[PDB]
Design a protein around this nucleic acid. Structure first.
Ligand SMILES: *P(=O)(O)OC[C@H]1O[C@@H](n2cnc3c(N)ncnc32)[C@H](O)[C@@H]1O
Length: 643
DNA sequence: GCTGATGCGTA
DNA sequence: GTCGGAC
DNA sequence: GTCCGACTACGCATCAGC
């Protein structure tokens, strides 16, 4: 009985402790009970083993259901390069809950905001749907198929057809299924277990219970013959095999069939990096100063590069001439850049047959020959576009080469990857140039280079080692680069003091308290408080709780007449304007919804804050002494990318 | 035909 | 994108 | 440091309502 399924017990037997016979469709309640055990605990090692116990039963009993269970665990619809999206958020989901329960739409919405979780609302609610015959139980493969049916619905009356499928899943839900069905559609499973733990559990499962055995499986625990140390070392080595293969081929549709046929030890023989298949990109960790760079990169030689304010473009050139461009989320952006594809012959030497370039697509003004801000880049059409209709030109800033002429450069150091990039590729001003770099260890040269990058319309500096731990192996370390921005440096930057005028009820980890706040600057001329941005990060859990304690005494039934928010989200609790906080941000943007400093730089648009975070409470200041809207306008114009 | 709410994907 | 929490 | 899930602004694409 899947209701009593306990994949977190001691001495879990993949065959006998399961809740379905061999060859049967894996019941979705087995996935739901697994999700229950995972969210109860907080140690990743316990979560991985609990999920591994489920996958071992799937491997031993119903191998065809391995893929949908893995996707349901990740809450994904398929490979990222296929661009499958549900099209369902909280708006559609809360409507499907109301129709399924006969409740008012706002009653469900208010309860969802109060409880901070939509899945809890769908669970305690009472179904108003009557069925002539009791529905069959949900299966993991059937539920996963319905999700892809919802994602496949487009056109007129799509919402009603999506809602019907969601309501069809709810009438067949048993026990905790409705809770996790709603969370999946809401996109907030709240497991504490994501892509890294799903892979860790997959490699542990296929290692302890090897696939491809005749039933019943002869080897059910391949680690019982090993010591605790030998078992740990072996499982860790098996985990790296899967992690590095998935880092180069993040496609479960390609790995899982190979895995069930040739095992994990022979997986690299059948799944290899190749152009046309997106790869996991290299990420960066923040650095709070030039001194910390030399500390993290002690002894090792590194290079400083401009950090361009654009969108990452992973450009693949296949053997044959086909070109594909992927985002850093492995989304296919080929149709977005007809101009880049036209430019490919201009960037490579005639000996270059195939490559994978790591570049930054930046909006480029061809009349003035200068970089344009990130907001200009986002105005480009996203769907299939034609090159003749392009209005915002892009310039590619290449900084790495991952693949060259049938050979992978993943395990080559950056010094060689960079050398191969600049030997085989041709620069063109305003179209394809190599990222501005500086090889140095001097603190004053790095400081001057950081100031020069901001003056040259860039966010700051990227710092990468050249020879020591300088490979492109994401499984070794996904954040092996360093980023140095001015807003990271203590004292070297501008911060704003804004008034808290509203609060937003928190979700998930913030459930039961405030998850966000609405901030405002003081407009001197109109003597009003103008909403500038929302704030929801920068404070500790202890600080957030004290914010929730004191601000509850400031809850107003209706807003004060001198508070202007315009198009901003109406706060859940209006707050009497009293608390003033210091806020840090990366940039100031021209906002389509916030009224702060409207008319001071633009007649229609106001100003907002890019990447805002809470620093400290300013008990010394009252709302009259907050940062003025005129000062907000001054800070916006002092930016290099702005007139 | 237009607009606004919703969803998604970039940072 | 930033951030803190649990490990 | 790793992994994870809270949270930010904003613009295109989509679709329901007018
Ligand atoms: P995130 O804040 O993790 O930073 C990494 C992204 O920065 C962009 N980027 C701009 N310029 C560079 C250079 N020179 N090297 C590497 N990355 C750069 C990329 O789009 C990254 O996604």
């Amino acid at each position: 009985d899947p209701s009593g399924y306990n994949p977190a017990k001691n001495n879990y037997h993949p065959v006998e402790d399961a809740c379905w016979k061999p060859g049967q469709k894996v019941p979705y309640l087995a996935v739901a009970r697994t999700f229950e055990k995972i969210e109860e605990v907080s140690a990743r090692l316990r979560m991985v083993e609990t999920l591994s116990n489920l996958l071992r039963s799937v491997v031993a009993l119903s191998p065809p259901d391995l893929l949908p269970v893995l996707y349901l665990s990740l809450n994904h619809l398929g490979p990222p390069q296929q661009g499958l999206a549900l099209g369902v958020g909280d708006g559609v989901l809360l409507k499907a809950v109301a129709q399924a329960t006969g409740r008012q739409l706002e009653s469900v919405r208010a309860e969802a905001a109060e409880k901070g979780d939509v899945g809890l609302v769908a669970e305690n609610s009472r179904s108003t749907q009557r069925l002539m015959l009791p529905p069959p139980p949900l299966t993991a493969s059937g539920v996963f198929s319905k999700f892809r049916d919802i994602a496949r619905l487009t056109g007129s009356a799509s919402t009603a057809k999506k809602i019907d499928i969601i309501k069809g899943l709810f009438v067949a839900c048993r026990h905790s299924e409705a809770r996790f069905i709603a969370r999946s559609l809401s996109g907030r499973l709240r497991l504490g277990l994501a892509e890294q733990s799903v892979l860790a559990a997959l490699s542990q499962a296929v290692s302890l219970t090897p696939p491809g055995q005749e039933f019943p499986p002869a080897m059910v625990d391949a680690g019982k013959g090993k010591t605790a140390e030998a078992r740990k070392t072996w499982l860790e080595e098996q985990g790296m095999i899967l992690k590095q293969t998935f880092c180069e081929v993040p496609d479960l549709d390609r790995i899982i069939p190979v895995l069930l046929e040739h095992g994990l030890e022979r997986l690299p023989e059948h799944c290899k990096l190749s152009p046309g298949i997106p790869l996991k990109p290299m990420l960066a960790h923040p650095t709070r100063g030039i001194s910390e760079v030399l500390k993290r990169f002690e002894e090792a030689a590194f290079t400083c590069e401009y950090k361009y304010d654009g969108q990452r473009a992973q450009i693949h050139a296949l053997e044959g001439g086909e070109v594909k461009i992927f985002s850093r989320n492995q989304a296919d952006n080929t149709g977005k850049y007809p101009d880049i594809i036209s430019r490919i012959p201009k960037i490579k030497l005639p000996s270059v047959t195939s490559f994978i370039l790591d570049t930054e697509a930046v909006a480029w003004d061809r009349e003035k020959k200068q970089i344009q801000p990130f907001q200009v880049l986002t105005t480009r059409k996203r769907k299939e576009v034609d090159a003749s209709e392009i209005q915002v030109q892009v310039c590619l800033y290449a900084f790495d080469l991952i693949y060259l002429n049938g050979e992978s450069l993943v395990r080559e150091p950056l010094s060689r990857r960079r050398q191969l990039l600049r030997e085989n590729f041709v620069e063109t001003e305003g179209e394809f140039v190599f990222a501005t770099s500086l090889d140095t260890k001097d603190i004053e040269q790095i400081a001057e280079f950081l100031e020069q990058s901001v003056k040259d319309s860039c966010e700051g500096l990227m710092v990468k080692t050249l020879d020591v731990d300088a490979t492109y192996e994401i499984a070794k370390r996904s954040h092996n680069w360093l980023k140095l921005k001015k807003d990271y440096l203590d004292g070297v930057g501008d911060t704003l003091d804004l008034v808290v005028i509203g609060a937003y009820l928190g979700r998930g980890k913030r459930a039961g308290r405030y998850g966000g706040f609405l901030l405002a600057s003081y407009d001197e001329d109109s003597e009003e408080l103008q909403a500038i941005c929302k704030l929801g990060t920068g404070f500790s859990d202890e600080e957030l709780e004290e914010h929730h304690q004191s601000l509850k005494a400031l809850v107003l039934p209706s807003p004060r007449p001198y508070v202007r928010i315009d198009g901003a989200v109406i706060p859940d609790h209006w707050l009497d304007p009293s608390a003033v906080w210091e806020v840090n941000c990366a940039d100031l943007s021209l906002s389509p919804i916030y009224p702060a400093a409207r008319g001071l730089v633009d007649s229609d648009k106001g100003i907002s804050l890019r990447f805002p975070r809470f620093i400290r409470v300013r008990e010394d200041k009252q709302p009259e002494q907050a940062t003025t809207s005129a000062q907000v306008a001054c800070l916006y114009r002092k930016q290099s990318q702005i007139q």
